[PDB]
Design a binder for this molecule. Structure first.
Ligand SMILES: OC[C@H]1O[C@@](CO)(O[C@H]2O[C@H](CO)[C@@H](O)[C@H](O)[C@H]2O)[C@@H](O)[C@@H]1O
Length: 628
């Protein structure tokens, strides 16, 4: 394999002797050159582990590097300063100061200009991280909420122009807020130019997707493929009008990109560099699990998928160090953590914690949550979880059957209960969610609905408000970067129009994708309304998290509370958090608290609590005790 020094000499071959000498002494080249030596080895090794001796590897690689240099050379000076800061501070993602928020630009603020006018609110809330849902061109009507990309560079006209996007990003950086967007690298819409030209037989896009002449191979692949949207189609393939079949893990209008073609990696790396130079701080790598296929396997979490992501990572370390990756893997817990690494995805969603927060609200027993916090929370250095309560997606019950089995819980039976409970098909349930993708051949099913709808705020359950604070308190204090689903901080309910909208009716996820609720937001400072109670109480926790060093980092050690209804953990051996998941008062005995200081200040209620006597928590009460 070629080395960094050799490849760099060829990068400079585009310049004449005179120009070359100039580049050689330029600061930008010195930076690029240095990073090349440090990170190229990783890029080469990863690409080689996937493509091996492919004739196109070297040519593609040199093309990619020439492009990377030009990209970095063009990269704005201010962004280069962030590159340097990020290089020296890899743990910025682990700081307790970070608090994130996510929203659809159209649903939350109409368009990009309106979104820009919302930044003051974001500052008011304390956000330092803002993730914006799919903003680029996509099919009219059905685009899976923008996840069917027809272009990675042209902004959705209803949202604005690429120029408005740069302004938003600039304004966000000005307000001390990092910009986060998706990089839907596993698939494009069937309307993307690459898809059209590939299907048309254009030789320049040959093998950019997986297209078959008939069902022979698809049938074989389907023997082991998991169905993501069984409502849409069986297996992982959709048929074209001409009779051929294309790989479509998701909607039929979302075509899976063929990373087995090195030219596909190169093309996507080019798109990534474009996003990077827009000033994006973090890219949410959509469906990282599916970027590699292999007959006879589930075609999820394969070795090459990880390798390819680690390759993309090295490209950033070389051409835009400030850009981090956020893994979005909604799979088995054993697989989820594999995407998280300083050299792969520095951060990643923590679906296990999210899914278990809801499990605990339903069962009132913290067993599974405690187990997860005890054995699957701590991560390798310079990485962090993105902890959340809800998102634009349905809730999948991705806890491990193996973990459950150890607690004497049947995974399959338990999900049946959870699914019944959260869609209000279980006696006494307080949840008002809606089913999503119930698969009759597997029994699998997911849940849609906003945080407030699932906790019972729609029917004014007196415990609804406190339930929301409890869930969010855990995502805000366990360690990691918390991501608030904007709208939750004021108890926004489900959208009551989606079910009859012909473009949304077959996707219950729109139930939990409501528009900015003027009314609720106008009540955020009124302590007598649910909106104000949720907001002020959530804002208080944010204020505490960001100013109190005891919440720094992402490591935690659980504490055995000896009360099956109360979760307990300790941060930096100085902050003891208790969360009561029962709708009834629950107690932590003095006996259990004997080793703790006799007194401790509770950051939540602001009162000093005695630990040398039975500690009783009110229904869904949360305590953040400073024991050091
Ligand atoms: O139920 C959705 C299903 O898709 C996943 C795959 O990671 O979610 C991401 O990708 C989908 C297809 O591109 C998007 O529709 C979805 O919005 C996005 O978060 C998982 O959440 C799940 O397996």
């Amino acid at each position: 394999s070629p080395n960094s020094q050799y490849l760099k000499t060829r990068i400079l071959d585009i310049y004449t002797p005179e120009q070359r000498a100039g580049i050689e002494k330029s600061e930008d080249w010195r930076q690029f050159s240095r990073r090349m030596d440090t990170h190229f080895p990783k890029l080469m090794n990863e690409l080689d582990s996937v493509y091996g001796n492919n004739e196109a590897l070297l040519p593609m690689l040199e093309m990619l590097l020439a492009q990377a240099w030009q990209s970095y050379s063009q990269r704005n000076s201010s962004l280069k300063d962030i590159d340097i800061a990020r290089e020296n501070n890899p743990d910025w993602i682990l700081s307790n100061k970070q608090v994130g928020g996510v929203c659809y630009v159209d649903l939350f603020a109409g368009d990009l200009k309106g979104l820009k006018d919302k930044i003051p609110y974001f500052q008011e809330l304390g956000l330092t991280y803002l993730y914006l849902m799919p903003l680029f061109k996509c099919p009219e009507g059905k685009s899976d909420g923008g996840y069917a990309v027809s272009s990675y560079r042209d902004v959705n006209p209803a949202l604005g122009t690429i120029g408005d996007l740069r302004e938003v990003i600039a304004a966000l950086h000005e307000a001390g807020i990092s910009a986060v967007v998706d990089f839907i690298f596993n698939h494009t819409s069937n309307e993307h130019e690459w898809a059209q030209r590939c299907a048309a037989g254009d030789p320049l896009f040959d093998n950019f997707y997986y297209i078959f002449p008939d069902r022979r191979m698809p049938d074989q692949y389907d023997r082991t493929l998991r169905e993501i949207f069984p409502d849409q189609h069986p297996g992982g393939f959709s048929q074209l009008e001409d009779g051929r079949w294309v790989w479509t893990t998701f909607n039929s209008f979302q075509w899976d990109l063929n990373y087995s073609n090195p030219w596909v990696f190169r093309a996507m790396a080019g798109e990534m560099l474009f996003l990077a130079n827009l000033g994006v701080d973090i890219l949410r790598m959509d469906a990282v699990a599916f970027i590699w296929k292999q007959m006879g396997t589930s075609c999820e979490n394969l070795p090459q998928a990880h390798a390819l992501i680690r390759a993309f990572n090295a490209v950033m370390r070389i051409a835009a160090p400030a850009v981090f990756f956020k893994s979005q893997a909604i799979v088995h817990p054993d697989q989820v953590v594999q995407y998280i690494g300083q050299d792969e995805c520095q951060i990643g969603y923590n679906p296990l914690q999210m899914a278990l927060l809801w499990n605990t609200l339903a069962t009132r027993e913290v067993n599974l949550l405690h187990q997860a916090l005890t054995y699957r929370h701590n991560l390798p250095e310079h990485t962090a979880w993105v902890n959340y309560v809800r998102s634009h997606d349905d809730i999948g019950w991705t806890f491990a059957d193996e973990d459950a089995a150890y607690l004497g819980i049947s995974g399959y039976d338990h999900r049946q209960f959870l699914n019944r409970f959260f869609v209000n098909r279980f006696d006494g349930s307080f949840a008002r969610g809606v089913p999503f993708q119930y698969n009759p051949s597997t029994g699998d099913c997911r849940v849609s609905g906003t945080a407030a709808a699932l906790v019972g705020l729609a029917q004014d359950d007196p415990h609804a408000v406190d339930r929301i604070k409890l869930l969010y308190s855990i995502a805000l204090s366990t360690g990691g970067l918390p991501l608030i689903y904007l709208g939750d901080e004021v108890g926004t309910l489900n959208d009551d129009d989606w079910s009859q909208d012909s473009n949304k009716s077959d996707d219950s996820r729109w139930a939990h994708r409501p528009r900015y609720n003027e009314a609720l937001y106008a009540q955020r400072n009124d302590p007598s309304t649910a909106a104000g109670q949720i907001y002020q109480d959530l804002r208080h926790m944010i204020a505490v998290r960001q100013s109190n060093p005891r919440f720094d980092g992402g490591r935690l050690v659980t504490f055995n509370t000896n009360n099956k209804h109360i979760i307990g953990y300790i941060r930096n051996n100085a902050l003891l958090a208790f969360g009561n998941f029962s709708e009834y008062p629950q107690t932590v005995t003095a006996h259990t608290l004997q080793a703790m200081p006799f007194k401790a200040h509770d950051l939540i209620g602001g009162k000093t609590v005695s630990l040398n006597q039975d500690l009783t928590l009110q229904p869904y009460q949360v305590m953040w005790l400073e024991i050091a």
